[PDB]
Structure formats: structure tokens, C-alpha cells
Amino acid sequence: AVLYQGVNCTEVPNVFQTRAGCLIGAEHVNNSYECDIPIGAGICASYQQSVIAYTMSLGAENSVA
Amino acid sequence: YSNNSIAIPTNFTISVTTEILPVSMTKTSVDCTMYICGDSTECSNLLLQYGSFCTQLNRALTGIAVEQDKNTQEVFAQVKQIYKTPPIKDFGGFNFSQILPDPSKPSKRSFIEDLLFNKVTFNGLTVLPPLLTDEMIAQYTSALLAGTITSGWTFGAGAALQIPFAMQMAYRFNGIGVTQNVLYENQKLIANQFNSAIGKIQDSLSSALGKLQDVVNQNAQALNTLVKQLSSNFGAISSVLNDILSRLDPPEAEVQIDRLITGRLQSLQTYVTQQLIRAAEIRASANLAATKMSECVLGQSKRVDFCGKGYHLMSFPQSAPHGVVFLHVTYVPAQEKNFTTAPAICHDGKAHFPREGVFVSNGTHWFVTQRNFYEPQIITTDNTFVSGNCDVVIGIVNNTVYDPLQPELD
Amino acid sequence: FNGLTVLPPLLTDEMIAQYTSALLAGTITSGWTFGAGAALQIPFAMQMAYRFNGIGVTQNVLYENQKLIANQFNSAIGKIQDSLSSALGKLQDV
Amino acid sequence: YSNNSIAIPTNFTISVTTEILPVSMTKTSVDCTMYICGDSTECSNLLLQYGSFCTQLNRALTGIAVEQDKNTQEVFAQVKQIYKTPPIKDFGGFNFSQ
Amino acid sequence: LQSLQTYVTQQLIRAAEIRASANLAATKMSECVLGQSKRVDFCGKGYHL
Ligand SMILES: *[C@@H]1O[C@H](CO[C@@H]2O[C@@H](C)[C@@H](O)[C@@H](O)[C@@H]2O)[C@@H](O[C@@H]2O[C@H](CO)[C@@H](O)[C@H](O)[C@H]2NC(C)=O)[C@H](O)[C@H]1NC(C)=O
Ligand SMILES: *[C@@H]1O[C@H](CO)[C@@H](O[C@@H]2O[C@H](CO)[C@@H](O)[C@H](O)[C@H]2NC(C)=O)[C@H](O)[C@H]1NC(C)=O
Ligand SMILES: *[C@@H]1O[C@H](CO)[C@@H](O[C@@H]2O[C@H](CO)[C@@H](O)[C@H](O)[C@H]2NC(C)=O)[C@H](O)[C@H]1NC(C)=O
Ligand SMILES: *[C@@H]1O[C@H](CO)[C@@H](O[C@@H]2O[C@H](CO)[C@@H](O)[C@H](O)[C@H]2NC(C)=O)[C@H](O)[C@H]1NC(C)=O
Ligand SMILES: *[C@@H]1O[C@H](CO)[C@@H](O)[C@H](O)[C@H]1NC(C)=O
Numbered sequence A: 001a002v003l004y005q006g007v008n009c010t011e012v013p014n015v016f017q018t019r020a021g022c023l024i025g026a027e028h029v030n031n032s033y034e035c036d037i038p039i040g041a042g043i044c045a046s047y048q049q050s051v052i053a054y055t056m057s058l059g060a061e062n063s064v065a
Numbered sequence B: 001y002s003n004n005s006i007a008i009p010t011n012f013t014i015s016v017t018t019e020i021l022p023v024s025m026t027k028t029s030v031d032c033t034m035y036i037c038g039d040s041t042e043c044s045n046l047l048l049q050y051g052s053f054c055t056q057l058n059r060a061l062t063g064i065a066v067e068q069d070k071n072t073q074e075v076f077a078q079v080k081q082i083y084k085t086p087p088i089k090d091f092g093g094f095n096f097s098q099i100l101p102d103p104s105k106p107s108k109r110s111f112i113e114d115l116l117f118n119k120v121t122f123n124g125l126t127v128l129p130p131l132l133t134d135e136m137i138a139q140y141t142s143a144l145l146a147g148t149i150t151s152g153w154t155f156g157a158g159a160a161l162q163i164p165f166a167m168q169m170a171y172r173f174n175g176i177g178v179t180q181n182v183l184y185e186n187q188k189l190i191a192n193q194f195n196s197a198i199g200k201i202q203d204s205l206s207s208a209l210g211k212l213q214d215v216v217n218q219n220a221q222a223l224n225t226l227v228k229q230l231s232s233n234f235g236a237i238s239s240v241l242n243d244i245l246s247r248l249d250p251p252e253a254e255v256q257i258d259r260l261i262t263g264r265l266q267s268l269q270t271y272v273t274q275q276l277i278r279a280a281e282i283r284a285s286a287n288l289a290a291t292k293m294s295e296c297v298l299g300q301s302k303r304v305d306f307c308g309k310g311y312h313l314m315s316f317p318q319s320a321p322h323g324v325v326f327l328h329v330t331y332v333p334a335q336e337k338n339f340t341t342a343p344a345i346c347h348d349g350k351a352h353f354p355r356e357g358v359f360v361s362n363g364t365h366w367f368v369t370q371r372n373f374y375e376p377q378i379i380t381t382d383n384t385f386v387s388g389n390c391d392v393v394i395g396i397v398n399n400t401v402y403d404p405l406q407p408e409l410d
Numbered sequence C: 001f002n003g004l005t006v007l008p009p010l011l012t013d014e015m016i017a018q019y020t021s022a023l024l025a026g027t028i029t030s031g032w033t034f035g036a037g038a039a040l041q042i043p044f045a046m047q048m049a050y051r052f053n054g055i056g057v058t059q060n061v062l063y064e065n066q067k068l069i070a071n072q073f074n075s076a077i078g079k080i081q082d083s084l085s086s087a088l089g090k091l092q093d094v
Numbered sequence D: 001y002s003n004n005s006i007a008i009p010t011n012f013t014i015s016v017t018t019e020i021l022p023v024s025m026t027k028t029s030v031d032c033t034m035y036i037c038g039d040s041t042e043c044s045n046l047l048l049q050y051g052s053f054c055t056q057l058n059r060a061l062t063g064i065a066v067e068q069d070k071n072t073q074e075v076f077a078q079v080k081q082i083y084k085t086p087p088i089k090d091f092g093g094f095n096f097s098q
Numbered sequence E: 001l002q003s004l005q006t007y008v009t010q011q012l013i014r015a016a017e018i019r020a021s022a023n024l025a026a027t028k029m030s031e032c033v034l035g036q037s038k039r040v041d042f043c044g045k046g047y048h049l
């Protein structure tokens, strides 16, 4: 996947816009996992087939009784 | 000072203190060819002859940039799970509403976090965004604080185990050397003192964050010097490449382009070196912050003045722009009194020494008390142990020791 | 004479000596209570017995052997004084 | 080592040890124009074209100089008040005169 | 000018080293002098008094 850092996706020669920049070649998914490959602003990337992009999850959620 | 005089405190005070610690700095990158040359191809060809100077600069800046993210992750990411506080809030009389999150505020930050955030305010230079957004750091902080107030220190060692708040505070008083009944008998007084201390902290902030501001000022000043350095001639006819490229043929232009290249390259090297040194300093500060998070927040510390002045009880973390704030609760003795004291007591040709206590006299009677609080009690064989005879000890005194069994037999 | 100047430090040596004497007098008269709050007096032998409790030995062990411990401490201080006047390389290197 | 054998000490020794720690260094400042040029005005005019090189050097040296004072204050200034020892010195048999 | 830059850089590095040593000294003052330390070999060999 290719990340153009800081440029709007309009100003370029599976196009997903992040606060880091324009990411081309990766598919956005609603699910969240651990990071693996890090991109800025809470977006990570991983391989599982095509490369995907998601928001990282801090951890499991439980309530103490 | 006297050889038979002691001073024992008869009351206490709960004090809350704040500590500020920088954790990370801004992440910047610089493109050598754009800064030194711009869009000139002649300048680029002349630059190629100083081979491998820019790759090292880019490697240095990238290393600093990744180190910043490692710093932040080391400090805040110390919880396995995201614990939550129960909807019903009965923690004795203690009121944690100020430090707890509230949904109305932006990013679901606490009141004090919002007060903290307001206080701190084209040549190839780029600024990269950090990996963890502010909302994620706030979620980490809330998980740590909720785990603390609901389970105590057990969530650091393993799975979280619930315990009522007053019982946990009694455990901590045992930790500093005072008994549990001292807490249970004075619970409302302690709760009121803690609430007033939190109120004073909130008022004090909204009226202290110089350590965090200095980092921002230094970074901005370094960038401003770097950009301003482009205006210098360094000995050439002018500081603009587009003017030198015109008005001159290549053989005459190459020497002045060389002078400009040398000056700008030296400026870049100076900038990168000072950035490396500043990054090392910030790394040391971040390591200190991570150690404080482990030892003051997840546990109770016996180290002197590490967490704060007095006797440490517990700590609460908060997040601030590029840094962390620690609220330390401590126990301070007050209202002391004078007594006379003795090492041992000679009764029936024996020497009696205290078990975890000190002998005191109000001028007529002898009692045994705990060291950090005045709770006098009668001297019996349950309070004391026997060792030898009265000859050896210097300062032994004569008294009587009540034997509880004898009245029962009679 | 080429623009090189040496600036004097803010705290003179007498002020540092006063700080050190205050720390040491507070230690020998109040123990560890002056760090936590107001200083509280306690006889020296009783404080040393508290410290033996701190390392895991009982109090009667101190009270029964007080003169021996005092003599050992005095001899150790004497040996330190003799050793110095005969070690400060870390300060000299700077 | 054996599976039912132990060794218990029957006496003790009081030992005093010394530790040395550096705290601060000397504070120096350098004037660029005097060092590089002296009293030459031609040298000064030629130096102006390498703009802003000396201000950074002076800032660096000043920062080091103030950091030294912060070091000393952090180490020694840890007492609220200046306590004094009583004229009568009865500390058991311990002798702190040295 | 090159000589001056070299001098200033080495001074910055030495100052960082001295700062680390001063922080160690301040921690020792707090934990060994104002208190009694249970950390092994921090204050000295043996059991600290
Ligand atoms: C010294 O204390 C004794 C004992 O008083 C007890 O301990 C005190 C610390 C405090 O907790 C008191 O409330 C306790 O009762 C005093 O002796 C008592 O004095 C009162 C008043 O005259 C009398 O009613 C009691 O019967 C006395 N108790 C006994 C066992 O005789 C004594 O007066 C105190 N001395 C001084 C100088 O204040
Ligand atoms: C210990 O200190 C507390 C704090 O000052 C005392 O509680 C105060 O008592 C006075 C007089 O009764 C009241 O006017 C204050 O409102 C109390 N403050 C709080 C926070 O409750 C307490 O009386 C002291 N203990 C003793 C034995 O004197
Ligand atoms: C504590 O009690 C013992 C025994 O009751 C006292 O020891 C006596 O001291 C007197 C003082 O001259 C001697 O004449 C006696 O021979 C000692 N023994 C006995 C059995 O009386 C001791 O003095 C008392 N301590 C204080 C401080 O009065
Ligand atoms: C424990 O060690 C001390 C120190 O050596 C012993 O005290 C010495 O005893 C000898 C013989 O009585 C004397 O000659 C020395 O002058 C003593 N030194 C001091 C400093 O007092 C002590 O005897 C030892 N304890 C036992 C039970 O043997
Ligand atoms: C990109 O441009 C579009 C319109 O051309 C604008 O709506 C959008 O906000 C821009 N994105 C960024 C990140 O500036």
C-alpha cells in the first residue's frame, strides 16, 4: 500500500483519506484489532487476501463488581 | 533535644500535591534537497558530490520521531484492560467527580484535564502526527484511575479484585505505620480533608505548567532559526538561487552556488545535532515518568520523597499536552505534644521492652503508645516482652506491669 | 583575554556548609521525622534501636550492647579521617 | 550446603564507608566577536554574513550555566529550616565532633 | 568558527553527564539521609542504618 503524507487525495496523479494523508491500495474495515503496522492518528495497517486499514483498539473492556 | 524527652503527634492532615512531567516532543522531518536547493537541478548535481550527507540526516530525524511514540506508549500503556467505574458511586465520603470523566466535556476529559489543556498554548519542513490521539490517552488514564479506585493495587499484579474503598484506605494506613481503628474512627474528617484538598488544587490551577511550555518554546525557536538561516549570503552575491541562475553562465554560477550549499548544509547539521541532544533529555524524563506510574500509582511507595512529601498514600494520573500530571495524596502529622520516655521498665527484677510501641509518661503514670499517633494504653504482659535483668540497660525505670490472668484466677 | 569569562556560582561555599550542617543536626536530633513534617525530638539511643528494628534485629540487642556499638562507630570515624589524610579522583577529573 | 544445616551469626560489626559524587561544573562564557575577530571592524563585517551563528552559541552556553545552579539547588536545598544542635551533647557514647 | 562549534558541542554532552550524576546525588540525599533504605547496595554494603 502507498501512503502520500499530508496531501489531499484530489492532488494525486481503494483511496482512503486519513489525517496522516492519502492511503491507496488498502481497504477500510469497521472492525478493530491491535496495531501491527502503525500509521498516524490512531490508524494501523495489517495483512489478512489484501492489506487493510482500521482503528486500533486499546484493549478489552470489563467492569469491576 | 534531651536524653529523656520525646514528642508525639496527636492529629493528622491529608495533603494533595501536583507534579508535572514532560513525556514527548513534536515530530518533524526535513527534506535536504528541497531546503538546500529547491527546484534547481544544477544545485542538485552540485549537491551529489557531497555524497551520503542527507541520508544520515534523514535517518537521525526518523529515529527521533519513532522514539517519541515509544516514549508515550511506555508511559501510558500499562493496563491490560479498560476498566470502568460503576454507575453507583459510594466510596465512603470521598468525592472523585473532578478527576473522573464526564461525557459533556470534549474528548470525554475530566474537569482538571480540561483546565490543563487550555493553559499550555514550505522549505521541506513537515510535522508528523502522533500515533496515539488525545482521546486514546484519556481512555488509558480513565482506565488506570477507575481500576485504582475500584480494586486498589491488585490489578497491577494480576486480575483485579474488588474491595470497599474505606477498607483499602485502612490497608494503606497500615502501610504507613498507623492502625486501622485510627481510620475507622475518623472517617468523615479524612473524607472532608481530601475533598477540600482537591478543591484547592482545582482553584490553584485555574488562576504552573512551565516545564511543558519550555519544550514547545525551544522547538519553535529551533525551527525559526532554521528557516531564518536561508536569508544569509555566506559570501555569494545574493541569497536567492533563482537570481544566481539568471544573470550568470554556469562556470561562473557554480562557485557561488557552492558557497550557498556549504552554508546551508552546515546549518542543517547544527540543527540535527541539537535535536538529538534534546531528544536524549526528553527520553530520560519519560523514563522517570514511567517509573513513577508503576511505583506510585499501581502501588504504595516506601521510598522517601519519591511520590511526595509526607507519607505516601496513593496517586492519581492525569494527561496534559505532551506530558503527565500526578496528584499525590500524603499523610502529615500535626499538633505534637511533649512527654518523658524510657528504654525499658524494671519490674520484679526483669526488663520489659515494648512490642511495636514507645513508653511515655504524663508526669505521674506510664503508658505505652504507638509511635506515629497518641493512643496511650496500660502496660501489660501483652504489650511487652521480657529480656534479662535490670542491671545492663542505661535509663531503666521502675514501674508495675499488670498481669491479666491473675484477676481471673482470684 | 580572548573573550573567555568565568561566572561565579550563586551559592557560596559558606551557604552550602550551612545547608549541610542543618541537615546533619536535624538528623542527629530528630531522626527521620523532619523530612516528613515538623521535627520531633527523640533520644539518640532510642532512634538507633528503631533502626535496628528496621533491619530485622530486636531492640534489646542494641540496649544490651550499647557501649560496644558506640566504640565501634567512633573507631570507624577515626579510620575514615586517617584514610582521607594520606580518593577524590572523580572530582578531579571534571 | 546441606538439606538440614544452617549458619547463624553470633556478633556484628559497625562499618562506615564514603561515597563521592560530582554535582556541578564551572560556568564559562565566550564572546564570538572578540574571539574570532578581536577589535577588527573588517572582520566583523565579514562575520555578519554568516548570520545567527553566534546567538545560538551564546544561548547554549547560558543554558548550561543556569543548569549548573539548578543542579546545586536540587541537591543541597532540601531543608525548610536551619536546625541547630544543642550546646549539651549527650548522644549516648557516640562522638560526632569530627 | 569551526573550533568554537566543536567546543560548544562537547560542553553540551559533558553537561548532560553531570546532570545525570547530580540527579543520582539528589536521590541519595532524599532516600539515604532523610530516611532508612531497604534497597540493596544503594546506600552501602551491609544493612543500612
Ligand atoms: C496522667 O494520666 C492519668 C491517667 O489518665 C488516663 O490517661 C490519660 C492519658 C487520659 O486518657 C485520661 O482520660 C485517662 O483517664 C491521670 O490520672 C487520672 O486523673 C483523673 C483526673 O484527676 C482521675 O479522674 C482518674 O481517676 C485518674 N486515673 C487514675 C488511674 O488514677 C493523671 O491525672 C494524669 N496526670 C497529669 C499530670 O495530667
Ligand atoms: C484534628 O484536626 C482537625 C482539622 O482541623 C480538627 O477538626 C476541626 O475541628 C474544629 C473544632 O472542632 C472545627 O471547627 C473544624 O471544622 C474541624 N475541621 C474538620 C475538617 O473537620 C480536629 O478537631 C482535630 N482533632 C483534635 C483532637 O483536636
Ligand atoms: C527500683 O527498685 C529497686 C528495688 O526496689 C531499687 O534498687 C535499690 O536501690 C537502693 C538505692 O540505694 C539500694 O540501696 C537497694 O539495695 C536496691 N535494691 C533493693 C532491693 O532495694 C532501685 O533503686 C529503684 N530505682 C529507682 C530509680 O528508684
Ligand atoms: C563481638 O565482637 C567485639 C568486637 O571485637 C568483641 O569485643 C572485643 O572483645 C575483646 C575480648 O573481650 C576485647 O579485647 C576487645 O577490646 C573488644 N572490642 C571492643 C570494640 O569492645 C566482643 O567480645 C564480641 N562478642 C563475643 C560474644 O565474642
Ligand atoms: C480535499 O478537498 C476537498 C475539496 O476539494 C475538501 O472538501 C476536503 O476537506 C479536502 N481534504 C483535506 C484533508 O483538506
Ligand SMILES: *[C@@H]1O[C@H](CO)[C@@H](O)[C@H](O)[C@H]1NC(C)=O
Residues within 6 Å of the ligand: A030
Ligand atoms: C461500516 O460502518 C458504516 C457506517 O455505519 C456503514 O455504512 C457500513 O455499512 C459498515 N460496513 C460494514 C461492513 O459493516
Ligand SMILES: *[C@@H]1O[C@H](CO)[C@@H](O)[C@H](O)[C@H]1NC(C)=O
Residues within 6 Å of the ligand: B095, B097
Ligand atoms: C462532589 O463534588 C461536586 C463538585 O463540587 C458536587 O457537585 C457534588 O455534590 C459532590 N458530591 C457528590 C456525591 O457528587
Ligand SMILES: *[C@@H]1O[C@H](CO)[C@@H](O)[C@H](O)[C@H]1NC(C)=O
Residues within 6 Å of the ligand: B007, B336, B337, B338
Ligand atoms: C517541649 O518543651 C520545650 C521546652 O523548652 C519547648 O521548647 C517545646 O516547644 C515543647 N514541644 C512542643 C511540641 O510543644
Ligand SMILES: *[C@@H]1O[C@H](CO)[C@@H](O)[C@H](O)[C@H]1NC(C)=O
Residues within 6 Å of the ligand: B003, B004, B394, B395, B396, D090
Ligand atoms: C540524662 O542526662 C542526665 C544529665 O543531664 C543524667 O543525669 C542522666 O543519667 C541521663 N539519663 C540517661 C538515661 O542517660
Ligand SMILES: *[C@@H]1O[C@H](CO)[C@@H](O)[C@H](O)[C@H]1NC(C)=O
Residues within 6 Å of the ligand: D095, D097
Ligand atoms: C570526641 O572525639 C574528640 C576527637 O577525637 C575527642 O577530643 C573527644 O574527647 C571525644 N569525646 C567528646 C565527648 O568530645
